[PDB]
Amino acid sequence: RYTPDWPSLDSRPLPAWFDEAKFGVFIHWGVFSVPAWGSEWFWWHWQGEGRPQYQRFMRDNYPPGFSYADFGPQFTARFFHPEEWADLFQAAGAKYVVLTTKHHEGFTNWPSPVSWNWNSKDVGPHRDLVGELGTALRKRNIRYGLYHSLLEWFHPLYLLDKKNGFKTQHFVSAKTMPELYDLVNSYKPDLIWSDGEWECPDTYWNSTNFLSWLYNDSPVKDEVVVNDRWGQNCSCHHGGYYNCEDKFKPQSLPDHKWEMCTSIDKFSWGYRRDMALSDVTEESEIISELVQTVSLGGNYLLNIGPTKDGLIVPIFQERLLAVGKWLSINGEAIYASKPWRVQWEKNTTSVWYTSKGSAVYAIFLHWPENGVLNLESPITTSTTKITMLGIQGDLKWSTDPDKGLFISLPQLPPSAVPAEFAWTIKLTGVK
Amino acid sequence: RYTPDWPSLDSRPLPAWFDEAKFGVFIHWGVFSVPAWGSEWFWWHWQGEGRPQYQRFMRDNYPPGFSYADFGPQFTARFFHPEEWADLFQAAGAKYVVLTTKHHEGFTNWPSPVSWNWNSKDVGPHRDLVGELGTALRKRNIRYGLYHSLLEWFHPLYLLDKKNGFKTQHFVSAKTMPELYDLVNSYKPDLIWSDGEWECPDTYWNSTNFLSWLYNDSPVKDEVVVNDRWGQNCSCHHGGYYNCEDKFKPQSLPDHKWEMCTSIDKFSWGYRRDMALSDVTEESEIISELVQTVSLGGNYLLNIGPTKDGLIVPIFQERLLAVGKWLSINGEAIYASKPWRVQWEKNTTSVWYTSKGSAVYAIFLHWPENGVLNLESPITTSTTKITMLGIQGDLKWSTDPDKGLFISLPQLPPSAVPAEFAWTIKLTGVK
């Protein structure tokens, strides 16, 4: 039992599935995919701020007087195949998939009763995208997360509440709470990814009451996790796990379960038609951030943006499949692992540490030129074995008294290494 | 002061402007003008009943999966000129203009806060049609009426209330009452034309409370009139004036102020692109219904349907201008008139009676072949004068003792009569 206050809500232990999942896939999909230009913040940058480049794009691409709601019918999504998406996510090694159900534009990706003619069923796809994706993911035993944005940029009731100093709660009682309850009662989410909370306190958003209901009387009360974006000054302070800031890259080990959210497109979470090759994050950088995040006790949430036709572009597929290929070899050092006592060597070639049971995994991203890996932190016992995940056969190792351990790496010819950018050394019987 | 009950509300006397206005113009305009096929009931006939002809039209005219909300962006209304509309309505002799602010499709023709992205400001015209038309009409001193449909066919909250036996009032508190209050507080209507009430009792619609507020604390509390469509079994029983049934044609004189609503297009209140010439009501039939309605103490509300571009087609303009030309001659027998003691001769060639002050007007629609008009009802005094509105000069008349009065009509050559289908005889000093 939990009471509608933060000290009680924060005492709820997180279900173990989230910490054992490690890797997840983020999907930013909505009406902003129709312009597919700039970012998913298109509407705010165009009308909220009146940026000249967005106005020029609107002038040169659409008739005068074109409004954002006119994008609604053009969100056809006629090539949407949730089974293909789920197969790709399974091949990528993802253990959970978080889909944006409603972004700051206010367009719900499910038939919301309080979003009539501004949802995916009434206009655009004419489908229940949330339900179809959830069915496809549940058939493959992949955990489901629903991203929900609390605020809406131009919703009249939210604007009225903002004018009133957020003393009234017309928007919260009309749209926010009914939509959250509908999203929880149906589709039975495993994860809730809240957003759009930087403008109002948690008292206005009714976050504590909804969280108490979710933890007490909801159909998913047991195996559900939420992030920290439930109001002003609530980020990285209150909630299940801490997203804190976007693309969070902590230096030291945090004392709370956290998650890193990053996008393959470095300049937009939503799809961009004119994405350059230099705007796509490299597979070496993606695997590197994942290794650092898992080593520091965090979850890795990689974002892709589907097109307005419901397609995932081949470059995103290539990145995801490379991540999955790397994971098919090095998963036992990632999935259901916990941080070690050091988590990285401060004197070697970028070595990070994970631990599972009695096994210690050293994931290194740079192959030493001289062919011997130096590991100062591990303490060798008489039953120490080096494995080099992906290669059958033990490795030669010498324990220097004054210096650290020295592991003789297998000198493999080109086009024979198991992975291409990061390698894992497994140590058994090491303190 | 009025209480929220029908006996108190019905005791409010109607302001005299409505009874003195006589002639009004009805405007059915909305998203249904985009298909412009069948009727303004397109959405219900297509999805509510699944009529094969509407499905065939959708198949042959639009891509598969096309939804009604996809019509929203196509309601461009780029040729809308409210000043031209108001000038035409003034030329037609109309004293009040009633515009549909929101029909059963739920699309509001003003920026309604509770109709986000389903209003004329957010999608389609990108204008405030109600406000622009009201400004244009007020500049010309024409009374303004707002048509509001209580029900919406496919609104999720209305469907939920219908499923619950109309015991809940989610739709009323979410959409209906806020929209009515917004429509009254802004645009300050002179008339409220309610509709969409045949499915629910007046208790569900909160009609008595809204009417008490309108009559007590509203900005238009003095000079406002409402019709009788405020709930089930409320038509022709409760309200300001009685529309009763559409195209109401009573035989005897009603004891309550009433209004006849008729459409120039006999098969649709909304605009139809494939309107035939045989579907357009003739000017002789329009003038005839107006004369009968005014004689029987009623108001005449003639309906036109603008195109999705905001244009009134030349045939509707021709009908309205013919009605205005007839009124420029015979207005003093219509405007600010009251029914006489007979209201029609039961033995002559379709003669109807109006009265203003001491003057009695006999409007006849059939020119007698023999050239003498027989009037049994009037009682002639020694100061009796026959005028024949539109022609200067008295008329010869003989009072038969056993029979009635015989008026010698002016034998005019062709292309010399003032009007073309109905003529007015003015009698002064007649009991």
Next chain:
Amino acid sequence: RYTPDWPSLDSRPLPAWFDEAKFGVFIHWGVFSVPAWGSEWFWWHWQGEGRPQYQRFMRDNYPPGFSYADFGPQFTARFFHPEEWADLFQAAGAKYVVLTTKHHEGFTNWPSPVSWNWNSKDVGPHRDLVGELGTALRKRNIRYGLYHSLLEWFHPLYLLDKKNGFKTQHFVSAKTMPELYDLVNSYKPDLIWSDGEWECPDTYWNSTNFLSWLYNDSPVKDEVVVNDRWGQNCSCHHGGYYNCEDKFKPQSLPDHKWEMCTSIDKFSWGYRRDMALSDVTEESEIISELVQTVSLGGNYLLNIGPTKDGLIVPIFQERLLAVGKWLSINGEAIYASKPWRVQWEKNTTSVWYTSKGSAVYAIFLHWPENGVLNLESPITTSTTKITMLGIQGDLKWSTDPDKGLFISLPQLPPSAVPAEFAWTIKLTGVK
């Protein structure tokens, strides 16, 4: 046998069907119906001259960079019913119908082999409009005329010929002659209405050779008529009949068969969406021009403009049906008639004269106030009878020695006259 020179071609007698037809209907239909703004000269006024109003219309109604060819796919014509058109034309009293097969825009309304992807079959309607209309008209025994514009404003080959001083004939051999031969060999026209000839001499257009082929070896060599627009300085000088100038209104009787072409819309031959009621020619003015044209030995060609959906608007239907109603009464004074020796009274109330056999018809457009019609021209014999077409029964008439004939008109009550704007007096046994 005829030689390719004007003196030989002009000696061909016209088939009698054209002179006996009298009344015809002109149809201007094409891609210019899609903008439906300004006139059928939209493309030239917009790009040829760069008029600011057309550029403003393009800016406010279509995305930037929109070209005229982009109008092609929008010419859907999905409500085109040629049987309905032919029934309306039969009801209007039309004896021939002339349809624009290709205007100055170059868009052919039939599958022209030399107009690939710029014809009605390839884009837009996806139909053979010329063939369908011809089939519908031939089923009702209505004569068929094909309007063909020689020039095209922006065709590259025509522009090249114009640059070369019209010394080359690339456009004529590539487009003009093959299209004329295809239009004659198929659809077997009864009439050819040439246009677009004011820029080049008849030598450039190969007019004499095509006309010699048409009169010698064509499938319609016997019953075919052509107008006078076959080159520079060819109008009203060379050809079958003389259109001379548009809306030609001669004062005296011409010595050659001529035709008056006029449009119901006074400011456009093509359809205009924003047509005003004041822009529509009145039925009194239409009947008046027809009476004057037939009296002076001419044919009357009335023009209508269908919408881009293939619909004839109700106002055009009303005008045509009024003309047909007038003709159902006064046809025997029009069809297969010839001009008399006077053709109009120079001292009476606008009386025009036709003659058929021994019968002389006096069509008057103004009803005399005193009720007696004065006719100075006719010479009365002892077997003279006045008929007053539309009314059974002879008329009283007195022959003044010094003055002319005086006919006592029937004093009809209102709503009893046969026609409404023009009346015909039939005289038998009159010199």
Next chain:
Amino acid sequence: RYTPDWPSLDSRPLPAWFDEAKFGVFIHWGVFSVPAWGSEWFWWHWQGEGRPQYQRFMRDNYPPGFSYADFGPQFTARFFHPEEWADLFQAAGAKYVVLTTKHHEGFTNWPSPVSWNWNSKDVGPHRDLVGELGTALRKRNIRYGLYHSLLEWFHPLYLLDKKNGFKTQHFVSAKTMPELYDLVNSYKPDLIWSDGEWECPDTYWNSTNFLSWLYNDSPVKDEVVVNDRWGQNCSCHHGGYYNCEDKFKPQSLPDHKWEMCTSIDKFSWGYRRDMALSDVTEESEIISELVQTVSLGGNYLLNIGPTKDGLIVPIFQERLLAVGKWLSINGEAIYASKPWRVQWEKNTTSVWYTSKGSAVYAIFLHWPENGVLNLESPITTSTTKITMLGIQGDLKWSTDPDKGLFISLPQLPPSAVPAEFAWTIKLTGVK
């Protein structure tokens, strides 16, 4: 001087630029990019053969009656930046770029006088794509090739010629020859890539006369090359160089200059919106085919398909940039090289031979596991040096008397090799 016959035309020596260019980029771009489904043969597969899948796609994606020409206005190409394209092609190492000016659909990508309203200037892009791309490529000193398809699937004149047994030449004189002359006189192509010739003999296509004019009196008569697709049975028999069959992979060394044309998308030369990652040719396979083609004395033409918006998708950019990165290291073994006397080792790990001057390059695609490369073919002299292109420093080598040469490869650690899939050994002073 050359005469219009094949023995004279085939005797013309090819300019050296084509043989020294080696690597080129093919661009398939046109109206077929608008559907972006199936292949660039969309129109023929949909209407020519009536394949059920294409009909289903048309039914589910476009309104009924939609025609291929209706795709024309949708070819907006609003993100076309030829400078970016040329920069990418320069970065990819391409020495010539061949753009499709007109495919079998008949849509010309330049303002063709004989393709009015079916060209890129009149509809769609409203630009001269050929001219803009040519300007961008010429600024960077990249050779320009124009792909021209002789036949058009549904052009009426071509169909008429086919019906007549190709005895008439209406299509050739109306469209083919004028378009070829316009494409040569303007844009001054360096290469002509003919296609669409498998249906008619070279006599019908007038190929010999056009080629004699091109080689004698054209502005590009000196430095111009053409392929072998100039008529029936002309492929791989007549012309400048031999494309023979698409994706030609000869086993032995041909005796004539040839070119391999291959597409990154294995199932379409045109862009496909639903391209899968498995449909994209791998960079290892692309580099492998290029090495085999250059070794066997051929040119490598890699094809990409831009979107209807004028964009090259990031996966195509990645492939091209990987090819360019490989070439920045191994270019001196490719550019301006000639085949050696062996061209491949028949007993080693896929070694191919090129030669430049006195230097012999052995390009191997498989790294030997034991680290020593065996080369039987080369004959070692006392001044023999092994270089291993990309690595500074000679290599140890031992000449076995009975066996071949054995080169000690540099044992490089992972993430230190110059290339990733193919390596080049340079031998100096070797017979």
